[model samples]
Target: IVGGTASVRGEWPWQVTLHTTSPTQRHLCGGSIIGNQWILTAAHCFYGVESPKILRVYSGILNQSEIAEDTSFFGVQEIIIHDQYKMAESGYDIALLKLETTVNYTDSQRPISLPSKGDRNVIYTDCWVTGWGYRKLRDKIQNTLQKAKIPLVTNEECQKRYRGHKITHKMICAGYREGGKDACKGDSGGPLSCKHNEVWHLVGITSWGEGCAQRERPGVYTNVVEYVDWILEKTQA
Candidate 1:
């Protein structure tokens, strides 16, 4: 009974595809259009730069069927990893990529609004998550962008479940016990945005998870709130 679907209103083709050619090749994950020249994704997705020459990003894809022809590829110019990030616990597993050029927003592609520092306190808000990750019922990764509607679960709730796993303030959780929705394998570092005052605010970054669409184990996300300072400082640096 595993399955998934995105609740976000995706305007086709704005999604980015993470791919590798050398050092074991495959489409690993998905990312979002944050700005004309930058993209956000999980740091672990590009660990150590063994095959930088083979990395390519395809944007403005409407469907998986069009990925072979309609998508545009961007060679990674630079990858900025969070200084405090650790692979052991997946701490600060977030990164921003500087693309070689800017992507023009169009009908099928668009940029999502980022949340401000003041918006961090709000938790348990309802939002949408979208990605081309593993489907809940299927054993393989999805070729099309799959999305789901999830309610933000507070850090306290996350800590209760993981127990001694060390749920840092830098992380967030979202899910429900009714159990029909969640993020999957290929959804890392994509946006988990909440709508407020008619504007969508990027609240969390899809970081990691145990499985697709699991109950109680709601998908874990990178707390954008706790990293505001680091993000601003890093970008300014």
Candidate 2:
């Protein structure tokens, strides 16, 4: 399903949109609800951004332009980026945003489960990535949410494909060998989820890539499993 279509409303309840407060209120990136008050995203989403106050979190909506009254909109209380994250590098690309108030769970708004400590390294060949990013590199941003199934690519294979680029242990790659489908510009910070034993676990957070839907250039993500302990420590506080 790499070259997939739009997602149904409430299909991915944990999906959240990160929007800027600029005049156009553009959707900057995608995020996942990890806790009632905590959101998981990529560090680069806020890079060079001065304040968290300038961002808004929107969840439970399929189309950004047609958001329902029941959809949730929360102001960010705090922004916590990984202390070791470096913009110039590809690893350690995760971050968390604390909502000013706990979000009420609904069929359309819920948190995605994280990998348990012992289950951190569990791998899934079949998983899905959801976002409202652009369909093509030169296309306009999407209004409707999109979901695509991308097979996980081993670190060794990924490194071989993107030779000069650093593919670290903290990163995960997913897509097709021939390509045709992948996450684009506005997709950063979105969820890469895998279903295991009837429950979906957040496996990755959309990070970076050479281009959208290119052969041998799969999308790179922040390995969520590698940061399980860090997420627990931060969210439990």
Candidate 3:
């Protein structure tokens, strides 16, 4: 995350690191554990990728350098990208990954609860985004996870800033207007969670933006609540 601080271990247990080995073995994107053998991320992260063999998921660790005995690694068994996702447009940017094995939950690893199916169009004012993404534009990605608090921005206000892009109803915007905190490169597919009552609900999946934390250019994310039914349909099957 850009303009964010190092995250505490187990602070965001559902956050995941998606690694790819096509061009090189590296952390390609962020993700969230949604089920025992399922992960939620962005479709764009695997845009040109072929074959699930090239991808791997790492969970239960705060820093990549220190992989504890409890840290889990799973090869991708299958990938399901939203059929409507098109590179030219920003809609339907979500994707799901089926792991080869079920995850062993620990204090540092667990699945985040999805928003209730009935909670459509719910906008969160207080939320946090976490990832091992870049700390700045053109900077190296962080080894340790980072987090930042970014409040939800109305679609009408977000559209005015990103006039060239279509801020569809399937997307949600979050960040400050003054532009200090945001999810940047390598942060795609990460979770945007909000606290409701005493439970944390997964609300958005990081998708796109104009640039990292620019004035009026808040980060855009896939509205997780809008696709809860779709997620359940795929995961349950």
**TM-score of each candidate structure, all chains considered together:** 0.87, 0.94, 0.94
Model 2 per-residue lDDT at 101: 93
Alpha-carbon lDDT of model 3: 0.87
What's the alpha carbon RMSD for model 1? Answer: 2.7
Collision count for each candidate, in order:
8, 0, 0
- Show where candidate 3 strays beyond 4 Å: 67-72, 121-123
Error of 3 at 158 (Å): 0.9
Tens-digit lDDT string for candidate 3 (1-237): 888888998999999899887787788899999899999999999977889999989988688786444555799999999888885146898999999999999898999999986666555666999998888888887888999999998889889888888888888889899998999989999999998777899999988888799887889999888898789888886
Steric clash pairs (candidate 1): 2-136, 2-137, 5-147, 6-147, 6-148, 12-108, 13-60, 13-61
lDDT of each: 0.70, 0.86, 0.87
Per residue, candidate 1 scores C-alpha lDDT tens digits across 111-150 of 7766777876655355877777766545566656776678
Count clashing pairs, candidate 1: 8
- Better candidate number, 1 or 2, judged by TM-score: 2
